[PDB]
Amino acid sequence: ACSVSASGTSSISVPSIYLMENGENSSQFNSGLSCTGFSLALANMTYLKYRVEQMSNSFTNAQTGEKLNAIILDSNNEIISLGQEKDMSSFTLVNLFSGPDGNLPFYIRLPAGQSVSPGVYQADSPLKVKWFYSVPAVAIVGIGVFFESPGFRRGGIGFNWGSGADSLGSLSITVLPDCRILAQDVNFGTAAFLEPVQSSMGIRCSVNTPYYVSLNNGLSPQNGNQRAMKSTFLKYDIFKNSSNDRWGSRWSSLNATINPVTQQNYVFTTKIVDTIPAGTYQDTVTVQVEF
Amino acid sequence: ATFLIWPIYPKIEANEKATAVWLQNTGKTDAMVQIRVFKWNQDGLKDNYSEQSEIIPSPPVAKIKAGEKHMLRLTKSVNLPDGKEQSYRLIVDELPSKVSFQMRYSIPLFAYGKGIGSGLTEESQKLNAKNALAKPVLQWSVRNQQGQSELYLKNNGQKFARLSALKTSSLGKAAFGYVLSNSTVKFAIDQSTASKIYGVDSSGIKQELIEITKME
C-alpha cells in the first residue's frame, strides 16, 4: 500500500576535497512517502500533491559551527521550496516509486566549492511534508482500489484533496576525511659520468587527518637497504629537505612546510652515491601514506 | 595518475556483513591497484601485521582507468566474537636517469562483533551506550630498554584510542599514535614528569580530551 514515514533519518557521505572540487551529484533519499502494490498500467490518474511544511537548505556541524548548503528536489528534479505546493499528479507518476519499499525519492545536491572539516552536518530543521494522494492499486488486490491520504475523494460526492498526511524525517551529510598525493619523477641530468636534484612531494589532506609518509628502498636494493637504480646498478639515496637525514621507513605530517583543508609539501634531495659510467638508470620508490 | 580513495577510516558494524571503499581515478592516465587486508595487533608492545581470511577484499587487484570508479568490497568471511573490536590494516598499492614514485595507502579498518560498534553512527552509538568498556581506558608507565627511555601505554577498554598530542601544558615528530583495544604499546621518549598524561583521541565522532593515569 501507500504509507507515510513519521520518523526517520537519511544520510549521505562525501569526502571533503571531492566535495570542494566537484560538489555532490543528485543523491536519492526517502521523501517521507512510500507506496507498494501500485498499478503500473498507467490507466488511472495518480493524484499526488505535496506541501513542504518544514525544510532547511543549511546543514550544521554541531561541534564547529560550520555549515553546508544543499539543494533539495522532488523526483522530477524540480527544486522544492517552502510555502509552495506542487501538484505532481499524472498517469505516469507511479514509475517514480523506487526500490523494494516503493520510496518516492527526493534528491539532495551539494554545489560549488564548499570547504568544511569532516564531521556530521545535520539539517538545521527536519523535513516535514504534507501529502495528498490517491494511487491506483495493482489489480490482484482488487478492482478500482486506491491508496489514499485521509479524506481524499476522487469524485454525489465532489473531488476533495482531504486533510493530508504528514511525513517527518531528518537529513544528515557526513563529510569524510580525504587526502590527495602528488609525487613527480626526479629527473637526473645528462650522462657521461650527475648533480643532486632537490624536488618535492605534495599532499592535500582534509583538516584533522594526520599521517606518516615513508619511502621504501626501491626495486633493487643492493645490501638490504641501499637504494639503487637499474641499468648494472647505480646507488642513490633520498634526504629530507637539504639535510643529511635519510628519508625512509619516516616523516610525520606535522613536520614539513604546512601552513594552514590543509596541504603538506615535503622537500627532499636525491643524491648519487658511487668513475661509474653512463647511464640511463631508473628506480621506482614506494611512498607509503599511513593513517 | 591522480588517485582518490575513501573512506580512509572504514569500519564494518556488527549488523553489517561488508562495507565499501571507493577507488576513483580523476587523472588522464590508467593505474593498477592491488588490495590486501592484514590483521593488526600490538603483541610484543609493537605493531604487527599478518595475513588473514576473515575480511576478504573484492577485488584483490583492479585496473582503474582514467575516469573510472570502482568499489572495493570488504566482506566478513566469518562472524566475530561478541563484544570485540577487531583491528585490520587495508593496504592498497597504486601504480600509475630518473626515480619514479608509486603510492601505498595504509588504512585502518575496524570490524565489530555483537554488542559493540564504531560509535560514528547513531545506531552504533546506542550499541556502545549499553556497553561500559566500549571506549579506550588508558594507563601509562615509563621503564627505561638498552638503555634508552620508552613510554608504555596500555588500553584496558574494548575500543582503540587514536592519540595525537600528549604531555601536560608535546612531542614533535609524532602525528598520531594507536593504542589498540586490550593492548599495550611502547614508544621512544626522553625527559621527566616524575601524575597523569593529557591527550586527544580522534577515535570517535569528535576530538575528545582523554585522561590517562600512571600504572602503579
Short mmCIF file of C-alpha atoms in Angstrom, two decimals:
data_model
loop_
_atom_site.label_atom_id
_atom_site.label_comp_id
_atom_site.label_asym_id
_atom_site.label_seq_id
_atom_site.Cartn_x
_atom_site.Cartn_y
_atom_site.Cartn_z
CA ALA A 1 0.00 0.00 0.00
CA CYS A 2 0.97 3.65 0.49
CA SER A 3 2.32 4.90 3.81
CA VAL A 4 3.97 7.96 5.31
CA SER A 5 7.14 7.88 7.43
CA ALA A 6 6.58 9.51 10.82
CA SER A 7 10.22 9.26 11.93
CA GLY A 8 13.40 8.57 10.03
CA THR A 9 16.90 9.69 9.11
CA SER A 10 18.53 9.97 5.71
CA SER A 11 22.28 10.29 5.32
CA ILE A 12 24.80 10.82 2.55
CA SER A 13 28.57 10.68 2.90
CA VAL A 14 31.01 12.68 0.74
CA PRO A 15 34.79 13.15 1.10
CA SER A 16 35.69 16.76 1.74
CA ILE A 17 38.10 17.69 -1.08
CA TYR A 18 35.95 15.98 -3.73
CA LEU A 19 33.07 17.97 -2.21
CA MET A 20 35.02 21.21 -2.65
CA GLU A 21 36.19 20.48 -6.21
CA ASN A 22 33.15 18.60 -7.55
CA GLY A 23 30.21 19.14 -5.22
CA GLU A 24 27.87 16.17 -4.91
CA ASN A 25 25.58 14.68 -7.54
CA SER A 26 21.83 14.31 -7.03
CA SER A 27 21.60 11.74 -4.23
CA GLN A 28 18.26 10.00 -3.79
CA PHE A 29 16.65 9.90 -0.35
CA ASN A 30 13.24 8.99 1.03
CA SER A 31 10.73 11.80 0.74
CA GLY A 32 8.54 10.53 3.55
CA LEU A 33 6.01 8.86 1.22
CA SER A 34 6.26 5.25 0.05
CA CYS A 35 3.93 3.04 -1.99
CA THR A 36 3.99 -0.66 -2.81
CA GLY A 37 1.44 -2.58 -4.85
CA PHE A 38 0.68 0.43 -7.04
CA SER A 39 -0.59 -0.33 -10.53
CA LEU A 40 1.81 0.21 -13.44
CA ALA A 41 -0.95 0.07 -16.07
CA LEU A 42 -1.00 3.90 -16.40
CA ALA A 43 -4.79 3.74 -16.87
CA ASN A 44 -5.84 5.74 -13.77
CA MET A 45 -4.60 9.21 -12.83
CA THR A 46 -2.26 9.17 -9.83
CA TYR A 47 -3.15 12.21 -7.71
CA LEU A 48 -0.27 13.47 -5.62
CA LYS A 49 0.42 16.92 -4.23
CA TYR A 50 2.91 17.76 -1.53
CA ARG A 51 3.34 20.77 0.75
CA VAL A 52 6.72 21.20 2.41
CA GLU A 53 5.80 22.47 5.88
CA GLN A 54 9.37 22.47 7.19
CA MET A 55 12.75 22.32 5.47
CA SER A 56 16.27 23.71 5.57
CA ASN A 57 18.92 24.01 2.89
CA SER A 58 21.51 24.68 5.64
CA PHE A 59 23.38 21.77 7.28
CA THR A 60 25.26 22.49 10.50
CA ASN A 61 28.11 20.64 12.17
CA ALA A 62 27.29 20.92 15.87
CA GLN A 63 30.91 20.85 17.03
CA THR A 64 32.44 23.52 14.77
CA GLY A 65 29.52 25.74 13.78
CA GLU A 66 30.50 25.24 10.11
CA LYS A 67 27.75 24.80 7.56
CA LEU A 68 26.95 23.28 4.18
CA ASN A 69 24.24 24.45 1.79
CA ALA A 70 22.19 21.97 -0.22
CA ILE A 71 19.56 21.95 -2.93
CA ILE A 72 16.53 19.68 -2.41
CA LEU A 73 14.49 18.39 -5.37
CA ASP A 74 11.26 16.46 -5.70
CA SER A 75 11.78 13.41 -8.03
CA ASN A 76 11.05 15.35 -11.17
CA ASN A 77 14.31 17.15 -10.21
CA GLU A 78 12.38 20.37 -9.64
CA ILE A 79 13.74 22.41 -6.73
CA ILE A 80 11.37 22.37 -3.79
CA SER A 81 10.71 25.50 -1.77
CA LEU A 82 8.88 26.13 1.49
CA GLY A 83 5.47 27.74 1.24
CA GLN A 84 4.59 26.49 -2.24
CA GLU A 85 2.61 23.36 -3.03
CA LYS A 86 3.33 21.31 -6.14
CA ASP A 87 0.79 19.04 -7.79
CA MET A 88 2.68 16.11 -9.33
CA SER A 89 -0.47 14.25 -10.49
CA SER A 90 -0.06 12.35 -13.78
CA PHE A 91 -0.74 8.92 -15.24
CA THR A 92 2.97 8.00 -15.13
CA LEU A 93 3.92 9.32 -11.67
CA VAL A 94 3.65 5.72 -10.46
CA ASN A 95 7.01 4.81 -12.09
CA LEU A 96 8.99 7.22 -9.85
CA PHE A 97 8.48 4.91 -6.84
CA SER A 98 11.87 3.31 -6.33
CA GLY A 99 13.36 0.36 -4.50
CA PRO A 100 11.60 -2.51 -2.77
CA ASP A 101 9.94 -0.16 -0.24
CA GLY A 102 8.48 1.92 -3.10
CA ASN A 103 10.06 5.09 -1.76
CA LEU A 104 9.06 8.23 -3.58
CA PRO A 105 12.52 9.79 -3.96
CA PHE A 106 13.69 13.26 -3.24
CA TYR A 107 17.16 14.40 -4.17
CA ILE A 108 19.85 16.35 -2.39
CA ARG A 109 22.55 18.18 -4.31
CA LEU A 110 25.60 19.98 -2.94
CA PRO A 111 27.09 22.56 -5.30
CA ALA A 112 30.10 24.74 -5.52
CA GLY A 113 33.41 24.90 -3.70
CA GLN A 114 32.18 24.31 -0.17
CA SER A 115 35.15 23.55 2.08
CA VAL A 116 34.37 22.18 5.57
CA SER A 117 36.07 19.96 8.11
CA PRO A 118 34.99 16.29 8.27
CA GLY A 119 32.10 15.69 10.62
CA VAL A 120 28.34 15.35 10.66
CA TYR A 121 26.43 18.21 9.05
CA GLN A 122 22.85 17.96 10.26
CA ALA A 123 19.94 19.74 8.62
CA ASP A 124 19.03 22.81 10.64
CA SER A 125 15.40 21.68 10.69
CA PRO A 126 13.74 18.36 9.90
CA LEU A 127 11.98 17.85 6.60
CA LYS A 128 8.23 17.80 7.29
CA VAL A 129 5.92 17.29 4.31
CA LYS A 130 2.14 17.12 3.99
CA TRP A 131 0.96 14.71 1.30
CA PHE A 132 -2.36 14.44 -0.57
CA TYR A 133 -2.57 11.27 -2.66
CA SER A 134 -4.72 8.66 -4.37
CA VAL A 135 -2.65 5.93 -6.04
CA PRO A 136 -4.21 3.17 -8.18
CA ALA A 137 -3.57 -0.27 -6.70
CA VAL A 138 -2.44 -3.31 -8.66
CA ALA A 139 -5.37 -5.41 -9.84
CA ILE A 140 -4.74 -8.58 -7.82
CA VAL A 141 -5.56 -6.67 -4.61
CA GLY A 142 -8.86 -5.57 -6.11
CA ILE A 143 -10.54 -3.74 -8.96
CA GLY A 144 -10.93 0.00 -8.60
CA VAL A 145 -9.00 0.19 -5.33
CA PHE A 146 -6.81 3.19 -4.46
CA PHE A 147 -4.26 4.05 -1.78
CA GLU A 148 -5.36 7.43 -0.43
CA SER A 149 -4.43 10.03 2.12
CA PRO A 150 -7.10 10.88 4.72
CA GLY A 151 -10.32 12.43 3.50
CA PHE A 152 -9.43 12.06 -0.17
CA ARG A 153 -12.32 11.88 -2.65
CA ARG A 154 -11.56 11.18 -6.29
CA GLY A 155 -15.08 12.41 -7.10
CA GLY A 156 -22.92 12.75 -5.48
CA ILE A 157 -19.51 13.38 -3.88
CA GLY A 158 -17.22 16.11 -5.17
CA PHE A 159 -13.48 15.90 -5.59
CA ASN A 160 -11.55 16.66 -2.39
CA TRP A 161 -7.83 16.57 -1.57
CA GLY A 162 -8.68 15.87 2.08
CA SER A 163 -6.67 16.92 5.10
CA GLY A 164 -3.41 15.26 4.05
CA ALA A 165 -0.86 13.06 5.81
CA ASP A 166 2.37 14.32 7.34
CA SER A 167 5.82 12.81 6.97
CA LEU A 168 8.80 13.85 9.09
CA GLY A 169 12.44 12.94 8.53
CA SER A 170 15.87 14.22 9.39
CA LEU A 171 18.68 14.83 6.90
CA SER A 172 22.39 14.47 7.60
CA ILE A 173 25.52 14.84 5.50
CA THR A 174 28.68 13.16 6.70
CA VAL A 175 31.82 14.80 5.36
CA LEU A 176 34.66 12.24 5.29
CA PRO A 177 38.42 12.71 5.61
CA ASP A 178 40.21 12.78 2.30
CA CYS A 179 43.79 13.01 1.02
CA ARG A 180 45.39 13.53 -2.39
CA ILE A 181 49.05 12.71 -3.08
CA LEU A 182 51.15 14.22 -5.89
CA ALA A 183 54.70 12.91 -6.38
CA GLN A 184 56.51 13.65 -9.64
CA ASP A 185 59.60 11.97 -11.08
CA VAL A 186 63.10 13.01 -10.02
CA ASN A 187 64.99 13.53 -13.31
CA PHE A 188 68.78 13.47 -13.11
CA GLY A 189 70.85 15.24 -15.73
CA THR A 190 72.60 14.10 -18.89
CA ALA A 191 75.05 11.16 -18.90
CA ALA A 192 78.78 10.52 -19.47
CA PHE A 193 79.61 10.22 -15.76
CA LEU A 194 75.26 13.75 -12.01
CA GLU A 195 74.38 16.69 -9.80
CA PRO A 196 71.84 16.23 -7.00
CA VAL A 197 68.18 17.07 -7.50
CA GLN A 198 66.14 18.96 -4.91
CA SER A 199 62.50 18.12 -5.64
CA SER A 200 59.32 17.83 -3.58
CA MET A 201 56.14 15.85 -2.95
CA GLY A 202 52.74 17.37 -2.15
CA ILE A 203 49.83 16.07 -0.07
CA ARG A 204 46.46 17.84 0.16
CA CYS A 205 44.57 16.39 3.12
CA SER A 206 41.40 17.29 4.98
CA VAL A 207 41.89 19.31 8.11
CA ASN A 208 42.24 16.86 11.00
CA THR A 209 43.87 13.89 9.25
CA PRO A 210 47.38 13.12 10.47
CA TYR A 211 49.63 10.59 8.76
CA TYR A 212 53.19 9.33 8.39
CA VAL A 213 54.94 9.30 4.98
CA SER A 214 57.54 6.56 4.49
CA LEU A 215 59.66 5.64 1.47
CA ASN A 216 60.95 2.13 0.83
CA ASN A 217 64.23 1.12 -0.80
CA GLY A 218 63.10 0.82 -4.45
CA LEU A 219 63.04 -2.26 -6.66
CA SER A 220 66.79 -3.03 -6.50
CA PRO A 221 68.28 -2.57 -3.01
CA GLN A 222 71.85 -3.77 -3.07
CA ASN A 223 72.83 -4.68 0.51
CA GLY A 224 69.35 -4.77 2.01
CA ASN A 225 68.77 -1.05 2.48
CA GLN A 226 70.93 0.77 -0.12
CA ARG A 227 68.73 2.17 -2.90
CA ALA A 228 69.93 1.60 -6.44
CA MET A 229 68.77 2.35 -9.98
CA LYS A 230 68.76 -0.41 -12.61
CA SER A 231 70.63 -0.15 -15.91
CA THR A 232 74.46 -2.84 -13.53
CA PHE A 233 73.27 -0.64 -10.67
CA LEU A 234 73.77 2.96 -9.59
CA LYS A 235 73.42 3.69 -5.87
CA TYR A 236 71.44 6.73 -4.69
CA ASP A 237 69.63 7.98 -1.62
CA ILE A 238 66.93 10.45 -0.66
CA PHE A 239 67.26 13.01 2.13
CA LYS A 240 64.74 15.27 3.85
CA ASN A 241 64.97 18.93 2.74
CA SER A 242 68.66 19.78 2.01
CA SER A 243 69.94 17.82 5.01
CA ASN A 244 71.83 14.56 5.59
CA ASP A 245 68.79 12.91 7.23
CA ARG A 246 67.75 9.90 5.16
CA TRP A 247 64.06 9.73 4.28
CA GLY A 248 62.89 6.14 4.67
CA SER A 249 60.83 3.84 6.90
CA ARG A 250 59.79 8.34 8.15
CA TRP A 251 58.19 11.76 8.07
CA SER A 252 55.34 12.99 10.22
CA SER A 253 52.72 15.16 8.55
CA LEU A 254 53.31 17.68 11.36
CA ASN A 255 56.95 18.37 10.32
CA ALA A 256 57.28 19.80 6.81
CA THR A 257 56.06 23.06 5.22
CA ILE A 258 52.44 23.06 6.43
CA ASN A 259 50.83 26.49 6.59
CA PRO A 260 47.11 26.22 7.41
CA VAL A 261 41.67 21.71 4.08
CA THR A 262 45.42 21.63 4.61
CA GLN A 263 48.33 20.95 2.32
CA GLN A 264 51.70 19.50 3.19
CA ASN A 265 54.74 19.72 0.93
CA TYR A 266 57.87 17.66 1.55
CA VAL A 267 61.17 18.86 0.11
CA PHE A 268 63.84 16.23 -0.48
CA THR A 269 67.20 15.94 -2.21
CA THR A 270 68.17 12.90 -4.27
CA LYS A 271 71.93 12.28 -4.39
CA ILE A 272 74.10 9.85 -6.37
CA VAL A 273 76.45 7.60 -4.39
CA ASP A 274 79.33 5.85 -6.19
CA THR A 275 84.02 6.77 -12.04
CA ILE A 276 80.82 4.79 -12.67
CA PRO A 277 79.91 5.11 -16.37
CA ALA A 278 76.71 6.25 -18.03
CA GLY A 279 73.87 5.94 -17.91
CA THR A 280 70.04 5.98 -18.18
CA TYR A 281 69.38 4.24 -14.83
CA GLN A 282 65.92 4.07 -13.20
CA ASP A 283 64.19 3.09 -9.95
CA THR A 284 60.67 3.23 -8.53
CA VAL A 285 60.23 4.09 -4.86
CA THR A 286 57.11 3.29 -2.86
CA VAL A 287 55.57 6.20 -0.97
CA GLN A 288 53.54 4.83 1.92
CA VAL A 289 50.97 7.11 3.48
CA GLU A 290 49.81 5.65 6.79
CA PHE A 291 46.71 6.84 8.70
CA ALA B 1 47.86 9.40 -12.04
CA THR B 2 45.61 11.17 -9.52
CA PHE B 3 44.12 8.56 -7.19
CA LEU B 4 41.20 9.14 -4.82
CA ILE B 5 40.44 6.50 -2.17
CA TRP B 6 37.76 6.91 0.53
CA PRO B 7 36.86 6.32 3.17
CA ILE B 8 40.28 6.21 4.87
CA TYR B 9 38.66 5.27 8.24
CA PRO B 10 36.36 2.41 7.20
CA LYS B 11 34.56 0.05 9.56
CA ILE B 12 32.14 -2.89 9.43
CA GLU B 13 29.41 -2.73 12.08
CA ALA B 14 28.11 -5.78 13.94
CA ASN B 15 24.93 -6.00 11.83
CA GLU B 16 26.80 -5.39 8.54
CA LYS B 17 28.32 -8.23 6.54
CA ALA B 18 30.51 -5.86 4.50
CA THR B 19 31.47 -2.27 3.78
CA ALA B 20 32.70 -0.46 0.68
CA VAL B 21 35.70 1.70 -0.18
CA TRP B 22 35.70 3.71 -3.40
CA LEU B 23 38.62 3.83 -5.82
CA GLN B 24 38.37 6.70 -8.30
CA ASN B 25 40.87 7.83 -10.95
CA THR B 26 40.35 11.50 -11.82
CA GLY B 27 43.59 11.77 -13.83
CA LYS B 28 44.22 11.12 -17.51
CA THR B 29 46.42 8.01 -17.10
CA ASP B 30 45.41 4.50 -16.09
CA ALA B 31 46.59 2.92 -12.82
CA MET B 32 46.86 -0.59 -11.40
CA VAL B 33 45.79 -1.24 -7.82
CA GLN B 34 46.48 -4.20 -5.54
CA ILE B 35 44.39 -4.58 -2.38
CA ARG B 36 45.30 -6.67 0.68
CA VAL B 37 43.88 -6.77 4.21
CA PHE B 38 46.09 -7.67 7.17
CA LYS B 39 45.19 -8.41 10.76
CA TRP B 40 46.60 -5.79 13.10
CA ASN B 41 47.71 -6.48 16.67
CA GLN B 42 50.06 -4.89 19.15
CA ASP B 43 51.62 -8.03 20.61
CA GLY B 44 55.20 -7.64 21.77
CA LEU B 45 54.46 -3.97 22.54
CA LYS B 46 54.64 -3.10 18.84
CA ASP B 47 52.50 -3.11 15.72
CA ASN B 48 52.42 -6.48 13.95
CA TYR B 49 50.55 -7.34 10.76
CA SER B 50 49.57 -10.76 9.43
CA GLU B 51 47.77 -12.44 6.55
CA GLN B 52 44.13 -13.19 7.23
CA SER B 53 40.96 -14.62 5.64
CA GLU B 54 38.39 -13.05 8.00
CA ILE B 55 37.99 -9.92 5.84
CA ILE B 56 38.21 -10.68 2.14
CA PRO B 57 38.70 -7.72 -0.25
CA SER B 58 36.94 -7.88 -3.59
CA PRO B 59 38.63 -7.45 -5.95
CA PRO B 60 42.19 -8.21 -4.78
CA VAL B 61 43.53 -6.41 -7.91
CA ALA B 62 41.94 -3.83 -10.19
CA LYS B 63 42.84 -1.65 -13.15
CA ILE B 64 41.46 1.84 -12.52
CA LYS B 65 41.44 3.60 -15.88
CA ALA B 66 41.02 7.34 -16.32
CA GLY B 67 37.57 8.39 -15.18
CA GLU B 68 36.71 5.03 -13.62
CA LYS B 69 35.15 4.50 -10.20
CA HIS B 70 35.45 1.03 -8.69
CA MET B 71 34.02 -0.29 -5.44
CA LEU B 72 36.31 -2.19 -3.09
CA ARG B 73 34.09 -4.60 -1.17
CA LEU B 74 35.35 -5.65 2.28
CA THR B 75 33.35 -8.70 3.35
CA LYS B 76 33.48 -10.69 6.60
CA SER B 77 34.07 -14.38 5.90
CA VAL B 78 33.03 -15.38 9.43
CA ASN B 79 31.33 -13.72 12.38
CA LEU B 80 33.42 -12.06 15.06
CA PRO B 81 33.30 -12.72 18.82
CA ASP B 82 30.62 -10.84 20.70
CA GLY B 83 31.70 -7.52 22.21
CA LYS B 84 35.02 -7.32 20.35
CA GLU B 85 36.63 -4.73 18.08
CA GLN B 86 38.90 -6.47 15.55
CA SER B 87 41.65 -4.34 14.02
CA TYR B 88 42.99 -4.65 10.48
CA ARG B 89 45.10 -2.66 8.01
CA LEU B 90 43.82 -2.11 4.48
CA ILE B 91 46.82 -1.89 2.13
CA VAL B 92 46.29 -0.64 -1.42
CA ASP B 93 49.26 -0.19 -3.77
CA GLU B 94 48.74 2.35 -6.59
CA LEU B 95 50.90 2.06 -9.72
CA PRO B 96 50.48 4.80 -12.41
CA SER B 97 68.25 8.68 -15.13
CA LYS B 98 65.12 9.10 -13.05
CA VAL B 99 63.39 7.95 -9.87
CA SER B 100 59.61 7.49 -10.09
CA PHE B 101 57.09 7.11 -7.27
CA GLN B 102 54.21 4.71 -6.72
CA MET B 103 51.75 5.07 -3.83
CA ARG B 104 50.88 2.80 -0.93
CA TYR B 105 47.92 3.55 1.35
CA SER B 106 47.92 2.04 4.84
CA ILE B 107 44.33 2.47 6.00
CA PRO B 108 42.94 1.49 9.44
CA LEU B 109 39.99 -0.89 9.31
CA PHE B 110 37.82 -2.00 12.23
CA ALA B 111 35.16 -4.70 12.41
CA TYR B 112 32.76 -5.26 15.29
CA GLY B 113 31.24 -8.27 16.96
CA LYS B 114 27.81 -8.24 18.54
CA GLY B 115 27.02 -5.62 21.14
CA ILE B 116 29.72 -3.11 20.16
CA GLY B 117 30.14 -0.61 17.32
CA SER B 118 32.25 2.19 15.85
CA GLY B 119 30.21 4.92 17.53
CA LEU B 120 30.29 7.06 14.37
CA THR B 121 26.65 6.24 13.54
CA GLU B 122 23.55 6.83 15.65
CA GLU B 123 22.85 3.09 15.73
CA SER B 124 26.41 2.21 16.77
CA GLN B 125 26.33 4.97 19.38
CA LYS B 126 23.30 3.31 21.01
CA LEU B 127 25.13 -0.03 20.95
CA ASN B 128 28.06 1.47 22.85
CA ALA B 129 25.67 3.21 25.24
CA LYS B 130 24.79 -0.24 26.65
CA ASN B 131 28.49 -1.16 26.97
CA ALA B 132 30.66 0.31 29.72
CA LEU B 133 34.02 -0.67 28.21
CA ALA B 134 33.16 0.46 24.64
CA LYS B 135 35.83 3.16 24.92
CA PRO B 136 39.59 3.39 25.46
CA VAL B 137 40.83 3.11 29.05
CA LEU B 138 44.45 4.21 29.03
CA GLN B 139 47.29 3.84 31.51
CA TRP B 140 50.94 4.78 31.18
CA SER B 141 54.29 3.88 32.76
CA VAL B 142 57.90 4.68 31.90
CA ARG B 143 60.55 1.99 32.23
CA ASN B 144 63.98 2.60 30.74
CA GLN B 145 65.34 -0.87 27.49
CA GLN B 146 69.04 -0.90 26.37
CA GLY B 147 69.33 1.66 27.61
CA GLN B 148 67.09 4.50 26.44
CA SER B 149 63.67 5.55 27.75
CA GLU B 150 60.36 4.21 26.47
CA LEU B 151 56.80 5.29 27.26
CA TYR B 152 54.33 2.42 27.72
CA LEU B 153 50.61 2.95 27.04
CA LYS B 154 48.03 0.33 27.97
CA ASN B 155 44.42 0.16 26.80
CA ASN B 156 42.04 -1.81 29.04
CA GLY B 157 38.96 -0.80 27.04
CA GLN B 158 37.26 -2.67 24.22
CA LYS B 159 37.86 0.16 21.68
CA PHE B 160 41.04 1.71 20.29
CA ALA B 161 42.47 5.13 21.05
CA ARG B 162 43.99 7.31 18.31
CA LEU B 163 46.17 9.73 20.27
CA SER B 164 47.59 12.91 18.73
CA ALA B 165 49.07 15.31 21.32
CA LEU B 166 50.26 14.24 24.78
CA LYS B 167 52.12 15.91 27.70
CA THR B 168 50.56 18.48 30.05
CA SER B 169 50.81 22.19 29.23
CA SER B 170 54.02 17.89 23.31
CA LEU B 171 56.37 15.58 21.40
CA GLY B 172 57.08 16.89 17.92
CA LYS B 173 57.59 14.35 15.14
CA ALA B 174 54.53 12.36 16.34
CA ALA B 175 51.50 12.77 14.11
CA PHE B 176 49.44 10.11 15.86
CA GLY B 177 49.67 7.01 17.99
CA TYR B 178 47.39 3.97 18.10
CA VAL B 179 46.71 2.06 21.31
CA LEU B 180 44.55 -0.87 20.25
CA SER B 181 41.87 -2.36 22.49
CA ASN B 182 43.13 -4.70 25.22
CA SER B 183 46.71 -3.98 24.18
CA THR B 184 49.90 -2.28 25.33
CA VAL B 185 52.44 -0.43 23.17
CA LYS B 186 55.67 1.44 23.84
CA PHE B 187 57.27 4.49 22.25
CA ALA B 188 60.55 6.46 22.18
CA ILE B 189 60.86 9.38 24.59
CA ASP B 190 63.09 11.34 27.00
CA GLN B 191 62.68 13.99 29.73
CA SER B 192 60.90 13.63 33.09
CA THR B 193 57.48 14.29 34.58
CA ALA B 194 58.07 12.49 37.90
CA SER B 195 50.61 12.24 37.81
CA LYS B 196 48.62 11.64 34.64
CA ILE B 197 49.08 12.39 30.97
CA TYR B 198 46.74 14.56 28.90
CA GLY B 199 45.87 13.52 25.35
CA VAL B 200 43.47 13.96 22.44
CA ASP B 201 41.66 10.95 20.96
CA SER B 202 40.27 11.01 17.43
CA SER B 203 38.75 7.51 17.57
CA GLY B 204 35.14 8.69 17.88
CA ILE B 205 32.90 11.29 16.31
CA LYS B 206 34.74 14.29 17.79
CA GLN B 207 38.15 15.08 19.25
CA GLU B 208 37.77 14.20 22.93
CA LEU B 209 40.24 15.20 25.61
CA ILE B 210 41.15 11.87 27.23
CA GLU B 211 42.94 11.42 30.55
CA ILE B 212 45.47 8.63 31.06
CA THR B 213 46.72 7.76 34.55
CA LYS B 214 50.02 6.20 35.57
CA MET B 215 50.42 2.47 36.17
CA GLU B 216 51.43 1.83 39.79
#
